[PDB]
Symmetry: C3
Subunit: 142 residues, 3 copies
């Protein structure tokens, strides 16, 4: 079976290598990020990522933030991130319900104070709280 396992691991590396060369994914630690280049609103990005078997991307580390920012830069668009401050204002949570730890707010942000429940990322990787109805680059994590 060890023959099978080595071969399997090698083939997985080949396919991920191919996708990484084609610019179709970025691997960061345990996470893989990807975009198909389309721009839609926050709710539609969630459905899109979920349909593909993943989730709207969120950076929980400086390294993850840089990877998503590099995607925002390459595709030159603002990006919606997987966090919201719905139920309680000023209190941003990941979509799994956990309170946000790492942040990278653009100076002055977040300033919505009720009416801005989503978070967008600028091309320099910094964050702004925003309404959820804008068209933003869809980035998913797997």
């Amino acid at each position: 079976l060890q023959t099978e396992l080595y071969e399997i691991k090698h083939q997985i590396l080949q396919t991920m290598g191919v996708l990484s060369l084609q610019g179709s994914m970025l691997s960061v630690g345990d996470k893989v990020f990807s975009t198909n280049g389309q721009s839609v609103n926050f709710d539609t990005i969630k459905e899109m990522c979920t349909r593909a078997g993943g989730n709207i991307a969120v950076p929980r580390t400086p390294e993850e933030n840089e990877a998503i920012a590099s995607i925002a830069k390459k595709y030159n668009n603002y990006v919606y991130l997987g966090m919201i401050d719905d139920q309680t204002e000023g209190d941003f949570h990941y979509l799994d319900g956990a309170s946000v730890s790492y942040t990278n707010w653009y100076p002055g942000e977040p300033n919505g104070q009720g009416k801005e429940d989503c978070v967008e990322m600028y091309t320099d990787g910094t964050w702004n709280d925003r309404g959820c109805l804008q068209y933003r680059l869809a980035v998913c994590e797997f």
Copy 2:
């Protein structure tokens, strides 16, 4: 080894997630469908799919039919399916030799009665028996 197996399964899911996000595959049950968007005749589609390690797509379930129809719709072209009524007329078989079960004939079809040995799918997912020399969207199953 359980560490290896969990990691392997996760990486497989990441790559399939990426391909699904990019619109490069559709997963239905055990089957994966894909097209590269090219149009060729029936014999050439078979060679193309076989070269890639798969087979010309055929729907054996309503669910599979819908998936292929969604590809025909997205690419806006008629699609050749993996069935033929060669040796016996009115008797359509899969390419593995088995008699066809599920069908979705457009009203009046099949009407070839000798001279139409292939099957094409319209953009609404319904079927027509047809000659095999037309240029149709190549869709493969894996």
Copy 3:
């Protein structure tokens, strides 16, 4: 676990099938070749392939040569290969340090005699020793 292993192997085959259909990879024996279609110099191709988890492509067999030549033909560009004759002139080595075995020099080549330390492949698959600063099609192996 056998259920897991069969399923894993099948899913790997599906993803590789998809990538092969999309024209995003060529499998030869143990090797997988891929290009993203970009043209850069020798040093930049190495970095690009390494970033993706692979290496600049080199043919060690007639079969591997044909696969890379088919990529050079499809993309209609000269290709840099993973071999150099740096430290000793007339003495080409793979990037792992081993002396080159299989060759396919265009008639008259190699003729650099000091000043041509890289190797390019023409669209017909034959080789020429060349300087390393030209823009060539980036082809990686995994």
